[PDB]
A paper describes a structure:
The enzyme is a member of the [name] family B15 possessing [name] and 3′−5′ proofreading exonuclease activities.
The end-joining reaction requires the 3′−5′exonuclease activity of E9 that degrades the extremities of dsDNA to create 5′-ssDNA overhangs. The published family B polymerase structures in complex with DNA oligonucleotides, with or without an incoming nucleotide mimicking elongation or editing modes, indicate that considerable domain movements occur upon DNA binding leading to a closure of the structure compared to the apo forms. We performed SAXS experiments using an isomorphous exominus mutant of E9 bound to a 29-mer DNA hairpin to check if the best model would be obtained by adjusting only the position of the thumb domain, or if a movement of each individual domain would be required. Complex formation was confirmed by the decrease of the radius of gyration from 3.83 to 3.45 nm upon DNA binding. The comparison of the SAXS curve of the E9exominus/DNA complex with the calculated scattering of different E9 models showed that when individual domains of E9 are adjusted, the theoretical curve fits better (and the χ2 is lower) than when only the thumb domain is adjusted supporting the generalized domain movements upon DNA binding.
Author numbering: -3 to 306, 314 to 900, 904 to 1005
Write the structure that this text describes.
C-alpha cells in the first residue's frame, strides 16, 4: 500500500513528444521501484536588462546574482600594445520556459538543460532521498508526478545498498561465405543470462528447430531439451529450449520490452539487437515497443548513431522506459587502449590464473588454481568464468577443450585436452569457446547445435563477467555524480559534453561567464610528436620516473586559461623579437606573469609568446584543482572503507576524477569545446616539454660520489629567476662508498628513463628512491613532483609501444619475482623457429656482454656483431649440421574467413595416407630443391611451405630453404642495433632487399 519514501536514483530519461517530460527511475530499500515524472523546461541565462524587457514574461525565473562576463577571444600582437580584455558585470537570471525560445542575446547557451535541472533543484543524479509525498501525485501504479522537485527532493540521505536486475544476452546467426544478412540468414541461437534482484543467475538458450531434422529434434527432447510450439509454452527454468524462429523472435521481443535495469551486450547495438529487430519485422509484422513509465509515449526500437572525429561511431538504443541498453564493445573502446577489441582478446587479458599441475600424460593435463597458486581471489575470478567456459588457453598458445571441472568459492580444479610439458606451474587464460563457425553451420546437426548453444551462452555470460571486471555499474554512478548527468548518458556522450556539468557548477560558484564573440580560427596544437630511445639494448638497469599528472599541474602552475591570457606577442624578425622580449620583461614581470614560448601559428613568425596573469586563479586551473582534490578525497575514503561494495564505489569515483582531469588537455585544443584555448593548449604543451628537458639535462651525466649527487647542470628554474638554491652538488643520505653515473636515455610527454651504470637492483632501488627525494626537494618546484615507478632490468625497447624488460617495482626488493613485461609483439611457439629463438638468445647474451665492457662506438659493437652473423650464417649454409627440427613451424587448420593454406593442407590430405582434420595442429618448414643456390630474389615463400608429418624425411635432393629463416633472423638483429646505415648495407648485400624497422 504505502510507498517507501526512501529511494535511490538509478537512471534518468526523457520522452520527446510534443507534450514531453523528464523521468526518474528509482529503487527503494525493499526493492520496489518508483518512477517519478517531472515537467520539462528549456533553460536560458539572461542579463537583468534583457529579463526586464521580455516579450511575454518567462514561465518562471530565479536570480543568479552578479556575474562577470569576459571576452575570451584570443588575439595576436606584433608589439606590446595589448588592449585590456572586455569585461562587464550584471545581474543574471536563470529563466524557465515550456516551449523553446529564441532570446536575442542570452548567455551560457553551451550548457545542457538536464544539467540545469539537477543544479537548479539541488538534485544529485545518483543520490538517495526521503521523498516528501506531499509533493507527489500518483498517476499509474508505481508512477508519480512531481511539480515541485526542489521541495520533493529536499531531504538528501546517505547511500543505501540496492539490488538490481540485469539481462545479458548474445545471439548466433547462420552464414556460409559472406557476413550474415538479415534477408537470407536465420538466427540459430539466442542465449540469455538473467540476474535477479536476489543475485540468482538464470541461464537459458533458445535453439532454432527449423535448422534441424525432425529425428534430431526428437533426439534433443529424448536427451533433455524442452521443445515448444508458442511463446505461451516457454519455461524459463529450462536451460535448453528448441523452438521455431518466429517463437524465438517473439520471446526476444517479450524480454526486450521488460524494464530491466540494464540490458547488456557485446556489440549488440550494432549487430545482435539490430538483427533480432529486422528479422522480426521480416518474418512477422512486429516491432519491439518501448513505453514511458506513465504509458504516455510509445516508440519502436530503433538504433541511432553518434559520431566523433579526433574517429569512431557508436550505436545506441532509443528506449524511453528507463532501462539502460549498454554495449560493452563501445564502452571498452572509449575507456581502454588495447591492441585488439575482439572479445577473445579482451577476455584473455581479463581472465587468467596460475595452474599448479596435479596429473600428466594420456592427452589430458590437469591443473588446480587457488589462493596458494597465484594471488588472493584471482583463481576465484577464473573459477566463476569456468562455470560456462568450455576452452582454456594454457601458456599463451595451447588452446584446449575442458573435460571436467571442480569449482568452489576460491579455487578450481580443471582437466584439459592438451599435449604435455609438465612443469610445476603454468598460465591459464580464458575467453570464448574458439571454433570454426562457418564449418559447423555447413555440417549442422544436433551435436553441433548443442555445441553452439554452449558457445553462445558463454558469450552472454562473458558480458556479465566483463561487466563485473570493468566495474561498469559503479563507474556509471560515479560518472553520473561527477558529470552531473543521467546514468544512461555517461558513456553515451563524448568528453566535450561530460565536462560541461562540473564546468557549469564552477562558473556559477566563481560568478563568471566566458563569451567568445568571434569565429574561432582553425588549427588545434597538431604535431604527432613520437619518442625514440637513445639506444635499444640495455646492459644496465634503467630507472623509471613519472611526473605526477603533468598537464593538469602545468595548467595550475602557469594559470593557463583563456581569460587569464593577457595576450600573445609574435615577431617576424630578430629585431622585433628582441625589442618585444625586453619590453615583455619590463611590462609583465615574474612571478605575477609567466611568458611561454610556443610553436608559432604562422609560417613567417619566428617567435610566439603567450603571457598569462597568475594573480587571479583562472577557470581551467581551478576546475583541475577541484578534480585533483576530489580524487585525493576518494583515494582516502577508499583506504578507510572496508566493505568491498564501498571499496568499489570510492575506487570508481577516484577513477572518474582521473579521467575527467586528463580530458582537459585535449579539450583545450578541441575547437568545438567549452574549454578551447589555442594559447593555453599550446602553452601547456610547451611548459610540459620544458619540464621534461630540464629534468633530463640535470640527470644526464649526473654522478654520485661520496655522499654527494652531482647534477649535470644547475638547478635553475627554466621560466624565471627563482628563490631556490641552484647548486647542483647535493647531499644525499646514501653510502659514501657508492660511485655511480647516470644517463638520460629516453623521455616522452610525462616520463623519463634514466640508465644507471649498475645491475644491482637492490642498490638501484635504494638510489632511485633517493633520486626521487632530491628531485622533488631541490630540482623541481611549486606543484611539480615525480614518483619513481620501477627499475627495468634487461630493457630492450623500440618505443613506449614496443618494449621488453623485467620490471622490479618500487615496492619490490632484489629477490622477489619480477614482472616479465612484453608489449606490442607478435611471435612464440611456431611463428618463429627454434633456430631463430636459439640465435636471438645468443646474440642478445653476446650483445649485453659487449655493452658491459664499455668499449664501443655505435659501430665497434655493430661491425663486430654483423661479422659474427655472416660467419655463423655462412657456416650453417655450408656445414648444415642443424636438425630439420630447428626449422619447423606450426599452425592450426581451419576453413576460410587464409586462402593458400587450404590449398596446402588439401593437397597433403589428397596425397598422403594420413589426414589433417579441420581442427588439427600441423608442422611445416621452408624446403627447396638442393640445386637452388643462395637466392637474393624472393618469391611467394608460400610455394616452399612443406608440411612435415611423422613419416617425412628430408630429400637427398632437397635443402632447408635457409634464406627465409636468415632474412627474418637478421631483421630482428638489426632492430636491436642502433647504427642504421651499416645495417641497411648488410641486408641488401646478403638478401637483395631493404629491411623493416619497428618505428
Amino acid at each position: 500500500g504505502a510507498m517507501d519514501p526512501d529511494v535511490r536514483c538509478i537512471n534518468w530519461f526523457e520522452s520527446h513528444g510534443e507534450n514531453r517530460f523528464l523521468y526518474l527511475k528509482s529503487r527503494c530499500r525493499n526493492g520496489e521501484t518508483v518512477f517519478i515524472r517531472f515537467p520539462h523546461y528549456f533553460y536560458y541565462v539572461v542579463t537583468d536588462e534583457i529579463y526586464q524587457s521580455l516579450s511575454p514574461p518567462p514561465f518562471n525565473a530565479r536570480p543568479l546574482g552578479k556575474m562577470r562576463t569576459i571576452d575570451i577571444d584570443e588575439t595576436i600582437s606584433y608589439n606590446l600594445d595589448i588592449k585590456d580584455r572586455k569585461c562587464s558585470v550584471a545581474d543574471m537570471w536563470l529563466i524557465e520556459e515550456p516551449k523553446k525560445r529564441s532570446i536575442q542575446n542570452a548567455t551560457m547557451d553551451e550548457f545542457l538543460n538536464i544539467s540545469w535541472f539537477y543544479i537548479s533543484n539541488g538534485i544529485s543524479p545518483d543520490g538517495c532521498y526521503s521523498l516528501d509525498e506531499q509533493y507527489l501525485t500518483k498517476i499509474n501504479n508505481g508512477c508519480y508526478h512531481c511539480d515541485d522537485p526542489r521541495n520533493c527532493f529536499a531531504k538528501k540521505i546517505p547511500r543505501f545498498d540496492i539490488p538490481r536486475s540485469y539481462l545479458f544476452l548474445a545471439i548466433a546467426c547462420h552464414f556460409d561465405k559472406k557476413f550474415p544478412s538479415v534477408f537470407i540468414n536465420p538466427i540459430s541461437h539466442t542465449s540469455y543470462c538473467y540476474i535477479d534482484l536476489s543475485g540468482k543467475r538464470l541461464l537459458f538458450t533458445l535453439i532454432n528447430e527449423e535448422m534441424l531434422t525432425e529425428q534430431e529434434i526428437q533426439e534433443a527432447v529424448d536427451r533433455g531439451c524442452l521443445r515448444i510450439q508458442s511463446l505461451m509454452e516457454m519455461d524459463y527454468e529450462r536451460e535448453l529450449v528448441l523452438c521455431s524462429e518466429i517463437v524465438l523472435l517473439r520471446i526476444a521481443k517479450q524480454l526486450l520490452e521488460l524494464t530491466f535495469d540494464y540490458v547488456v551486450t557485446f556489440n549488440g547495438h550494432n549487430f545482435d539487437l539490430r538483427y533480432i529487430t529486422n528479422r522480426l519485422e521480416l518474418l512477422t509484422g512486429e516491432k519491439i515497443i518501448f513505453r514511458s513509465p506513465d504509458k504516455k509515449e510509445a516508440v519502436h526500437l530503433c538504433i541511432y548513431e553518434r559520431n566523433q572525429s579526433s574517429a569512431n561511431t557508436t550505436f545506441h538504443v532509443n528506449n524511453n522506459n528507463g532501462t539502460i541498453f549498454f554495449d560493452l564493445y563501445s564502452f571498452i573502446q572509449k575507456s581502454e587502449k588495447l591492441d585488439s577489441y575482439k572479445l577473445d582478446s579482451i577476455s584473455k587479458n581479463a581472465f587468467s590464473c596460475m595452474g599448479k599441475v596435479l596429473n600428466r600424460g594420456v592427452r589430458e593435463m590437469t591443473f588446480i588454481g587457488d589462493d596458494t597458486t597465484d594471488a588472493k581471489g584471482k583463481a576465484a575470478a577464473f573459477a566463476k568464468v569456468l562455470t560456462t567456459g568450455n576452452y582454456v588457453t594454457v601458456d599463451e598458445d595451447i588452446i584446449c577443450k575442458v573435460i571436467r571441472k571442480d569449482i568452489w568459492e576460491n579455487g578450481f580444479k580443471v582437466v584439459l585436452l592438451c599435449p604435455t610439458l609438465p612443469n610445476d606451474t603454468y598460465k591459464l587464460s580464458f575467453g570464448k569457446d574458439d571454433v570454426d563457425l562457418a564449418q559447423m553451420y555447413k555440417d549442422y546437426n544436433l551435436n553441433i547445435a548443442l555445441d553452439m548453444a554452449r558457445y553462445c551462452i558463454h558469450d552472454a555470460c562473458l558480458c556479465q563477467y566483463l561487466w563485473e571486471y570493468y566495474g561498469v555499474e559503479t563507474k556509471t554512478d560515479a560518472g553520473a555524480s561527477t558529470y552531473v548527468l543521467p546514468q544512461s548518458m555517461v558513456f553515451e556522450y563524448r568528453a566535450s559534453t561530460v565536462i560541461k556539468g562540473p564546468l557549469l557548477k564552477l562558473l556559477l560558484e566563481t560568478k563568471t561567464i566566458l563569451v567568445r564573440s568571434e569565429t574561432k580560427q582553425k588549427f588545434p596544437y597538431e604535431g604527432g610528436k613520437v619518442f625514440a630511445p637513445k639506444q635499444k639494448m640495455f646492459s644496465n638497469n634503467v630507472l623509471i620516473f613519472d611526473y605526477n599528472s603533468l598537464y593538469p599541474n602545468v595548467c595550475i602552475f602557469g594559470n593557463l586559461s583563456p581569460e587569464t591570457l593577457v595576450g600573445v606577442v609574435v615577431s617576424t624578425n630578430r629585431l622585433e623579437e628582441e625589442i618585444n622580449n625586453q619590453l615583455l620583461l619590463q611590462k609583465y614581470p615574474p612571478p605575477r606573469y609567466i611568458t611561454v614560448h610556443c610553436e608559432p601559428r604562422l609560417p613567417n613568425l619566428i617567435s610566439e609568446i603567450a603571457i598569462f596573469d597568475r594573480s587571479i586563479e583562472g577557470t581551467i586551473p581551478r576546475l583541475l584543482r577541484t578534480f585533483l582534490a576530489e580524487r585525493a578525497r576518494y583515494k582516502k575514503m577508499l583506504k578507510q572503507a572496508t566493505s568491498s561494495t564501498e571499496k568499489a564505489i570510492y575506487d570508481s569515483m577516484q577513477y572518474t576524477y582521473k579521467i575527467v582531469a586528463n580530458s582537459v588537455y585535449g579539450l583545450m585544443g578541441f575547437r568545438n569545446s567549452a574549454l578551447y584555448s589555442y594559447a593555453s593548449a599550446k602553452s601547456c604543451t610547451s611548459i610540459g616539454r620544458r619540464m621534461i628537458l630540464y629534468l633530463e639535462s640535470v640527470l644526464n651525466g649526473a654522478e654520485l660520489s661520496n655522499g654527494m649527487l652531482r647534477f649535470a647542470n644547475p638547478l635553475s628554474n627554466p621560466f624565471y629567476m627563482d628563490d631556490r638554491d641552484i647548486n647542483p652538488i647535493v647531499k644525499t643520505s646514501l653510502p659514501i662508498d657508492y660511485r655511480f653515473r647516470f644517463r638520460s636515455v629516453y623521455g616522452d610527454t610525462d616520463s623519463v628513463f634514466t640508465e644507471i651504470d649498475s645491475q644491482d637492483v637492490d642498490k638501484s632501488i635504494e638510489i632511485a628512491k633517493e633520486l626521487e627525494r632530491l628531485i622533488n626537494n631541490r630540482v623541481l618546484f611549486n606543484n611539480f613532483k615525480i614518483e619513481f615507478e620501477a627499475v627495468y632490468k634487461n630493457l630492450i625497447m623500440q618505443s613506449k609501444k614496443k618494449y621488453t624488460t623485467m620490471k622490479y617495482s618500487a615496492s619490490s626488493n632484489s629477490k622477489s619475482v619480477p614482472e616479465r613485461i612484453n608489449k606490442g609483439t607478435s611471435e612464440t611457439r611456431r611463428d618463429v623457429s627454434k633456430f631463430h629463438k636459439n640465435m636471438i638468445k645468443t646474440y642478445k647474451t653476446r650483445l649485453s656482454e659487449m655493452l658491459s665492457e664499455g668499449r664501443m662506438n655505435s659501430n665497434q659493437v655493430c661491425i663486430d656483431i654483423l661479422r659474427s652473423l655472416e660467419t655463423d650464417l655462412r657456416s650453417e649454409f655450408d656445414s648444415r649440421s642443424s636438425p630439420l627440427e630447428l626449422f619447423m613451424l606450426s599452425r592450426m587448420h581451419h576453413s576460410n574467413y587464409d586462402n593458400p593454406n587450404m590449398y596446402l593442407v588439401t593437397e597433403y590430405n589428397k596425397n598422403n595416407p594420413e589426414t589433417i582434420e579441420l581442427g588439427e595442429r600441423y608442422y611445416f618448414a621452408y624446403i627447396c630443391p638442393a640445386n637452388v643456390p643462395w637466392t637474393k630474389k624472393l618469391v611467394n615463400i608460400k610455394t616452399y611451405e612443406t608440411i612435415i608429418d611423422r613419416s617425412f624425411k628430408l630429400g637427398s635432393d632437397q635443402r632447408i630453404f635457409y634464406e627465409v629463416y636468415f632474412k627474418r633472423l637478421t631483421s630482428e638483429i638489426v632492430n636491436l642495433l642502433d647504427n642504421k646505415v651499416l645495417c641497411i648495407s648488410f641486408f641488401e648485400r646478403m638478401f637483395g632487399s631493404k629491411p623493416t624497422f619497428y618505428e
